[PDB]
Structures are given as C-alpha cells and as structure tokens.
Write a protein that binds this DNA or RNA. Structure first.
Ligand SMILES: [K+]
Ligand SMILES: [K+]
Ligand SMILES: [K+]
Ligand SMILES: [K+]
Ligand SMILES: [Mg+2]
Ligand SMILES: [Mg+2]
Ligand SMILES: [Mg+2]
Ligand SMILES: [Mg+2]
Ligand SMILES: [Mg+2]
Ligand SMILES: [Mg+2]
Ligand SMILES: [Mg+2]
Ligand SMILES: [Mg+2]
Ligand SMILES: [Mg+2]
Ligand SMILES: [Mg+2]
Ligand SMILES: [Mg+2]
Ligand SMILES: [Mg+2]
Ligand SMILES: [Zn+2]
Lengths: 35, 123, 56, 150, 204
RNA sequence: UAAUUGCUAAGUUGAAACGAAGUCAAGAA
RNA sequence: GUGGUUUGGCACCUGAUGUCGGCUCGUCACAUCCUGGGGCUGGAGAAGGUCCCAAGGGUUGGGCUCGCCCAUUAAAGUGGCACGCGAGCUGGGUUCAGAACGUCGUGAGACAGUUCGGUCUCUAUCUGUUGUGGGCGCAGGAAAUUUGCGAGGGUCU
RNA sequence: UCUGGUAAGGAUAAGUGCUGAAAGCAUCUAAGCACGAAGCCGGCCUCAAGAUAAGAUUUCCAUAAAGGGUGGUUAAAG
C-alpha cells in the first residue's frame, strides 16, 4: 500500500471514509491511498 | 522511629546519664524524699526499684552487686539496713511520684519522688 | 530568601490569629476552697486526693 | 443634595415578581432552547428587569431526554477539561453528559450563556431539569409556558 | 465476602513435602451480623459485621442502641462486606469455618507508621553526588524540582518528603495453609500489613 | 431567533505545486 | 512546500536576564529503538526490505574524552522544556591576578596556541509543591457504618 | 521473605469482509451488518460529600460519665 499526494488510475478509484483509494484485486501492488 | 525503645536518654551521653541516675538513687536512699523534674523522676523509678529488690537477699553477693550500681558506702549501709527493713514484705512499687508545679527559670514541670514506707499520712 | 514586599497589617494579623496563651487547668478544692492545678498537690494545705502529702 | 426628581427605580428583593414556569424540550434544539431558558432565568422578559438583582423565573424543564442535537454533534463535539496534573487533559461528549444525566448536560449548556459572576452562580440554581414528564413541585403552583411563543 | 481478624505473629512450618514455609497466624474469631443493608432501603446490598466483644463502659449510647436493635452484645470493630453466597439474618455468627473451602485470600490492613520521612527512604531517591569528591551538604537532598521559567512552577504529583506508612494496604492471593476452627485460627503463607494486634479484613 | 432568493453537509465556517472532481450552474463539440 | 534542531541575516527586550559538560529530579512530543496490529514485495518457508496505525511501558555496565572500543540486552531511539534544572550539587572546561614553551613585535606586550596553579555568597516574604492541623458551614446536637461526582497509581519483558 | 504486572469487558485506528444503488457492470458504504491493536474508556489498588449539587443508612439526645473539652497512665500513633 502506497500513500502519496497525487494518486491516479483495470484499477478502480473509490472513496471510503473521506479518503481516496485506487484498488485492483487482480494486481495488489497497485493499491494507493490518500488521493 | 523509636518503636519499642524503653528508656529515656534525658539529653545526656550514656556515661553522664548513668552517673546521674546513680547519684539520684543515692540521694533518694539517704533522704527519703527528693524534688526533681518529672522526666528525671520517671527515669529514676525505672532505675532504682530493682536496686531495692536486691535487699531481699542479705548476702555478700547482693551487697556487692548493689555496690556496683551505687559506689556509695553510706547509701549502701542505709539501704541494706533501715530501708530494707522497711520495704520488706512489699511486692514492688516502693516509690511514689507526685507533681507539684513549675520552675521560674525555665517552666520545668516539677515533682517529688519518695519511698512509700517513710510517708505516714499516705498510709 | 528575601521578602519581595513588606507585609500589610492585615496579613500580619491573619498570621497571628493562632497565637494565644494557654489557660491553666484549674480544679477547686472541695474542702479547702481555693484554686489549684488538677492532678497536682494543692500547695496551700499540702493535701492531695484527701491525704496529707507535704507536711508544713 | 438631589436635583434629579425623576429617577428610574431599581427592583429589589422585596419588589421582584418571581414565578415558577414549566417548559418542554420535546423536539427543540439544545442551544436554541437553552438561550431562551437563559433569558427566562436572567429576567429579560420582565419590565422591571434589574441587572444587579435575581429578578428572573424559576424554570422547570420536562422531557429533557427528548432534546435534539443536529449534525454529528452528539459525538463530534469534543469538550476538553484539565485535572491540574501533567498530561491531564481529558475529552468528553454530549453523549457522555446525557449518559450521566440530562440535568448535567443542560446545566453545562446554560452555564456559559449565563453571566460569569456571583449573581450568575446564584441564578443557575433556579433551574430544574427532569428526564420525564413526572416531577414533584406542589405548593408553588407552576405555570405552563409555550417556549415556541418566545 | 469475608470476616474481620487480628494478626498475632509469624512462624515457620514444614509442609507435607518438606518445604519450609513462612506463615502468618490470624485470629479470625466469631463475627456477628450487626446490620443488613438492602437495595430497596440503602441502595446496595451488604452485611455489617462486629468482631471483638466490648463492655458497656466503652460503648456510647447510640452504639448501644444500635446493637440492642440487632439483639447482640456490643462489639468493638464493625465493617461491611459484600457478595455473600447465601442469606444471613440479623444477629447470627460466622466463624473461621467460612474459609475452610478457600484456597487463596486477600488481606487488608493498615501498615506500620514511620512518621515524617525524607525522599531517600520514602521514594528511593539516589542522592546528590557522592559522599566525597566535593560533597558539601546535599547527600540526602532531592535535587532539582522543576524546569526553569517555561513551566515556572512545580508540577502536581512531584515526589517530596512527608508522612510515610500508617495507611490502608491490600495484599492479594495469599495461600491458605490451615484452618483451625477450635481456636479460631487461620494460617496464611507470607506477610500481612500492620503490627501485631492490628485489625484485618480477610476476603475470600 | 425580520422578510425574500439561492449555495454549503465539510462544524468547512461563524498556505502552494499537484490530485479525485463531492456538489450546483452555464455551455461547446 | 513544512520546520525552526545547523550555519547565518536583523539589532526589537535586558543601577548584571551571571557560567559548558557531568550529577539529581523530572515532564512533554513522535519524525518508533523494543514490545503490539497490519498492506506490498524481484516474500517458497526462515529471517529481511519498504509503507501504514500506534507514544502504554521499558530503553545496561565499563576503557577512553561528538566519536571509537570491550562485554551484554528484547532494546541500548530522536528531540523540546532559558542548548530543562548551580537562591539544588560539582568546578574537570571556561572570563582573573603567578609562571613557562613555540610564534609575532625594537619594546611595553600579543596569539587560529600549549602547559602547571588558582575563593561557587544569601536565616524562604508571595506564589508553587509535598505533608499535617485549627475554625465555620452542611446542621438543632451527636456516635458509627457507608455510596461514589471525581483524582492519582498500576500497564515492562 | 511473600505478593503483584497479567486477559481483553465496551467502543475503535490502520486494514479484512458480507448485501448493495448512485453509475442496469463493478464497488468494504452512501441506509445497514461482522471483525480487527501493548493505543482510548473500564475491570485492579489508594484517596475521595467544602461533590456549598455539602449525599445515604442505623442509633442516641443535654449533664453525668446524649456527646465532648481541659486533665492523667501511655502506644507497634507521632
Ligand atoms: K530494664
Ligand atoms: K507558567
Ligand atoms: K542550559
Ligand atoms: K483512573
Ligand atoms: Mg539532642
Ligand atoms: Mg567512657
Ligand atoms: Mg504563629
Ligand atoms: Mg511509628
Ligand atoms: Mg549514595
Ligand atoms: Mg566545598
Ligand atoms: Mg558535608
Ligand atoms: Mg533600526
Ligand atoms: Mg534592577
Ligand atoms: Mg536556578
Ligand atoms: Mg600573567
Ligand atoms: Mg596545590
Ligand atoms: Zn483540699
């Protein structure tokens, strides 16, 4: 899981609990936090 | 702390305290009633009554043991004569302390200590 | 170590609130009829608890 | 000597008109109801209001547990206090006050809209908060009041 | 639940498997039920117990009436206990057989009093410097008590000199060695707070 | 605790490069 | 962009705001040393790397004077508090009068230098802190047993 | 010389999930529901009604020893 100021996008962008996430269950090395 | 410590130092070194107690014992034996501060009299009551108990066995051994405390020939003679004759058949409590007042110079609490067998009005 | 200010009269008197002279514990002689200190030989007559103690 | 001859009269302990009123907290907002309660306690609704005299009304609040807090205030308003020791700051919520008792929450809110002096410390004792609609205040004959009219 | 008791002293015994044990002897003694407290009348449930028989010379009239209501002889020490596994009436007796099934007990007492004590004995302070190497007069001194002008105060809870001992202390999980109902005696393994003759609370 | 019309759901309210665009509104291809 | 912990710039406070390191006593923050919970791995397991949440408690003794070394430990964290703390300590270092070497100056003397020696004052008023009482109130007068609004401690491995 | 620290009772952090529209697909989430930390609130220990919001329960009520003070013999209390 990588946290950075600017996150960008088969990965999908979702919003959970006021935070931004980019998730990809096919490849978990592309998860991102705190957009 | 002083838990279960049962003698008064009386503001003196050990040798001075023992000498003063011996002198007071001799004075009480010679003159049957003396006047002194209350704390000193309460210490003397502890010190002197086992000395009077030693005259219930008139032996050379008891005379010498009493002389070890007293070191006073006249006091020893009076104690093993008339004092012993008077305090025979009394099981302890040979002395009595009665408070009197206070001194002018230091407001010390004053009393007198006496032998109960030489006071007649107190039965 | 040193007072920064002098104390006022009020502050001094407030501290001295607890300065007092102790009242002696006085008992009456039921027979003799005078004052003496409780648990102490009455020096006027020499009696203590109804018995003569100091013979004048 | 007095050259005025036309003064404004201040009420005193023997001239105030103190009354017992009952108000309801069925669906009102906490702060909006408590501001009107503070005005009632202070005596801003009386024509003989005098700022140096306890001239207000004794207020009984019923249905205190039905009060409403909008937004996320029931757990998002953080009250802070200090015990006086190092590392001694503590947090609590209006939910914690309500759990302890509605009178504690109401007293905390009203003290804060009242004046910060001896008179206000005396005034806060004229408020009575009860959880339900059942209270025992006979011998004084309290008067029902519509808080929405104020 | 529990009873009152009086500490007698310490001894040493040998267990069944040849282990030397240090033991404390407690005279637990018969405790009588002097008051019963209820949720419906007091606000909580508890039993009040009295321990040591007192003569009428040392019992005030309010206490004498309080005992007369419960129909018991006057006692010297009273204490409340909670959570009894049963029903107990007013004026009944409990003895050291109450602890027969117990394995571990807790003992509450008042520790011995030391009077005014300095920081070294009271708090284990290290002392300033050495006994030599320029020491002047701070051998048993506390040292610094603050941190200059930014706090500009001594914090609450700073450890200083003061009265030490003579306060309520609890010791937990003392193993019970033996119960002697014929002498009202309880043997526990270890030490209990207080001097000989002091009153204890023994909790099952 | 006026009147009327909108916006904000963040208790926002009473600092930037750089990111989603949460939301309303006006458009063009 | 952030911080103000490095080197600086400014000269706004000061009939004295009087000193480095060590000792004693702490207290706070987290930018986590150990212990606790997790995402990813070019992670087979085993240990590792990197990131996230988390500050409760712990975080040795010596030979040398920031740093090196010896032996341990779960670990031997980073900082702030007038580079925390001398009306609490020390005086090894540093501002003093003696003396010597090197260098500089005609000389008096001086020095990115070095070396041996060299007085650390004060009886605590207010506030603060740790303990312990007297008065009154609650309450018309009392003897006991208590509930807990709250406060502090404990929390390691 | 004895005893203790310990688990996690409740809500949670980072994360893991179920059902699910906005956006007919998908989605741990916006309405909901399970978990999940030495961290937070508790349990444990001591103080604690001057908590002036001064609480409760039992019993006794004025003068002798209803309660005390002063006093005395003293203490493992100071
Ligand atoms: K002896
Ligand atoms: K300050
Ligand atoms: K400094
Ligand atoms: K606590
Ligand atoms: Mg002396
Ligand atoms: Mg000699
Ligand atoms: Mg005085
Ligand atoms: Mg003691
Ligand atoms: Mg030492
Ligand atoms: Mg010196
Ligand atoms: Mg010295
Ligand atoms: Mg200028
Ligand atoms: Mg000046
Ligand atoms: Mg200083
Ligand atoms: Mg010179
Ligand atoms: Mg020399
Ligand atoms: Zn007489």
């Amino acid at each position: 899981m990588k946290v950075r100021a600017s996150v960008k996008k088969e990965c999908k962008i979702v919003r959970r609990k006021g935070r931004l996430y980019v998730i990809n269950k096919k490849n978990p090395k592309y998860k991102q936090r705190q957009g | 702390m002083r838990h279960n410590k049962k003698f008064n130092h009386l503001g003196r070194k050990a040798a001075h305290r023992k000498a003063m107690l011996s002198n007071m014992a001799a004075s009480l034996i010679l003159h049957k009633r003396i006047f002194t501060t209350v704390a000193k009299a309460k210490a003397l009551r502890i010190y002197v009554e086992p000395l009077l108990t030693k005259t219930k066995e008139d032996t050379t051994h008891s005379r010498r043991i009493a002389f070890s405390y007293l070191q006073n020939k006249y006091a020893l003679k009076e104690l093993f004569g008339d004092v012993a004759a008077k305090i025979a058949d009394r099981p302890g409590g040979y002395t009595r302390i009665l408070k009197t007042g206070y001194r002018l110079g230091d407001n010390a609490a004053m009393c007198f200590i006496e032998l109960v067998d030489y006071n007649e009005n107190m039965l | 170590a040193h007072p920064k200010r002098r104390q006022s009269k009020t502050r001094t008197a407030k501290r001295r609130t607890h300065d007092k002279a102790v009242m002696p514990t006085l008992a009456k002689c039921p027979n003799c009829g005078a004052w003496h200190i409780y648990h102490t030989v009455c020096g006027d007559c020499g009696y203590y608890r109804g018995k003569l103690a100091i013979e004048k | 000597m007095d050259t005025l001859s036309f003064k404004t009269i201040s009420a005193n302990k023997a001239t105030v008109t103190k009354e017992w009123v009952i108000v309801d907290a069925e669906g009102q907002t906490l702060g909006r109801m408590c501001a009107k309660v503070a005005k009632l306690l202070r005596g801003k609704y009386k024509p003989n209001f005098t700022p140096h005299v306890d001239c207000g009304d004794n207020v009984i609040v019923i249905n205190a547990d039905k009060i409403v807090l909008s937004g996320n205030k029931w757990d998002g308003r953080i009250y802070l206090r200090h015990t006086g020791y190092p590392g001694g700051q503590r947090q609590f919520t209006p939910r914690d006050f309500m759990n302890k008792g509605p009178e504690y929450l109401f007293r905390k809110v009203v003290k804060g809209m009242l004046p910060k002096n001896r008179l206000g410390a005396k005034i806060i004792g004229n408020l009575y908060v009860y959880a339900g609609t059942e209270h025992k205040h006979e011998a004084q004959q309290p008067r029902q009041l519509d808080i929405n009219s104020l | 639940p529990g009873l009152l008791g009086k500490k007698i002293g310490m001894t040493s015994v040998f267990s069944a498997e040849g282990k030397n044990l240090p033991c404390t002897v407690i005279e637990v003694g018969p405790c009588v039920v002097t008051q019963v407290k209820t949720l419906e009348k007091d606000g909580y449930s508890a039993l009040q117990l009295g321990f040591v028989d007192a003569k009428e010379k040392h019992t005030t009239k309010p206490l004498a009436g309080h005992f007369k209501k419960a129909n018991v002889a006057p006692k010297r020490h009273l204490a409340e206990f909670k959570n009894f596994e049963g029903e107990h009436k007013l004026g009944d007796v409990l003895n050291v057989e109450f602890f027969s099934d117990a394995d571990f007990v807790d003992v509450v007492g008042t520790s011995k009093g030391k009077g005014f004590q300095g920081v070294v004995k009271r708090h284990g302070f290290g002392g300033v410097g050495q006994a030599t190497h320029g020491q002047h007069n701070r051998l048993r001194a506390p040292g610094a008590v603050g941190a200059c002008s930014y706090p500009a105060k001594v914090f609450k809870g700073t450890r200083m000199a003061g009265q030490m001992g003579n306060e309520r202390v609890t010791v937990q999980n003392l193993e019970v060695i033996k119960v002697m109902p014929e002498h009202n005696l309880l043997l526990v393994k270890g030490s209990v707070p207080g001097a000989k003759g002091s009153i204890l609370l023994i909790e099952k």
